[PDB]
Design a protein around this nucleic acid. Structure first.
Ligand code: MN
Ligand code: MN
Length: 188
DNA sequence: GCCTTGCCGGGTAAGTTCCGGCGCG
DNA sequence: CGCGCCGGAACTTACCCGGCAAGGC
């Protein structure tokens, strides 16, 4: 559908490097933010914001894409109650992702929380249940993997891709053309 | 004599929630 | 009055990085 693919990729970034926030203010004002953060300004302005802007347009959401500069990172922010529930509802129906959405999610999840050097193929997160979902997805795709508690200080688990299948992983998932191409996959 | 990978500490690139605006029924 | 979009940025830590060494082949 391509809209389903971009959505799942973006969701991976959001759960990875950002989040969905339902704010309540004084009073009783409110706000619903869809947020991705990244240190690099080019990566937000050039690769993420275009994808989000396409999605904004295909759902007839007319919030704008805000790019806020913070002390330690840039924030791509959409203040929209409709876009918030679009992604929230997608997140609770995540085990029902078809295969096109599975590759797209793992892609964006790897961009956000993943070992960007690819010398090893690792992905970190405190959500063990979300990594077990991805683990089943990888297995059914023939990419063997493991989950251990990488960081005892903060309770962060790691999903390690076995390097046995490193070319299966990089060429099939990080490099698929059936949905948007990651930072270092579009070259290679 | 490699390679894979569990484990671990360093600290930065993330994440989270407050602020003060405005608009609209 | 009630609620939802802008634009900013302060406040902690969850990621990532990369070393080490144990275990396979
Ligand atoms: Mn994360
Ligand atoms: Mn990241």
């Amino acid at each position: 559908e391509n809209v389903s693919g971009i959505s799942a990729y973006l969701l991976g970034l959001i759960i990875g490097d950002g989040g969905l926030y339902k704010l309540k203010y004084k009073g009783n004002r409110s706000e619903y933010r869809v947020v991705i953060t990244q240190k690099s300004e080019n990566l937000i302005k050039q690769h993420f914001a275009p994808l989000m802007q396409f999605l904004i347009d295909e759902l007839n959401v007319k919030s704008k894409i805000q790019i806020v500069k913070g002390d330690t990172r840039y924030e791509l922010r959409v203040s929209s109650k409709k876009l918030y529930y679009y992604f929230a509802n997608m997140q609770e129906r995540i085990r029902l992702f078809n295969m096109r959405e599975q590759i797209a999610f793992i892609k964006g999840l790897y961009v956000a929380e993943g070992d960007k050097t690819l010398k090893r193929l690792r992905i970190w997160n405190k959500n063990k249940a979300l990594l077990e979902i991805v683990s089943r997805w990888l297995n059914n795709l023939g990419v063997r993997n493991t989950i251990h508690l990488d960081d005892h200080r903060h309770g962060v688990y790691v999903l390690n891709i076995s390097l046995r299948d490193r070319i299966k992983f990089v060429h099939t998932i990080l490099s698929s053309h059936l949905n948007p191409l990651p930072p270092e996959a579009a070259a290679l």
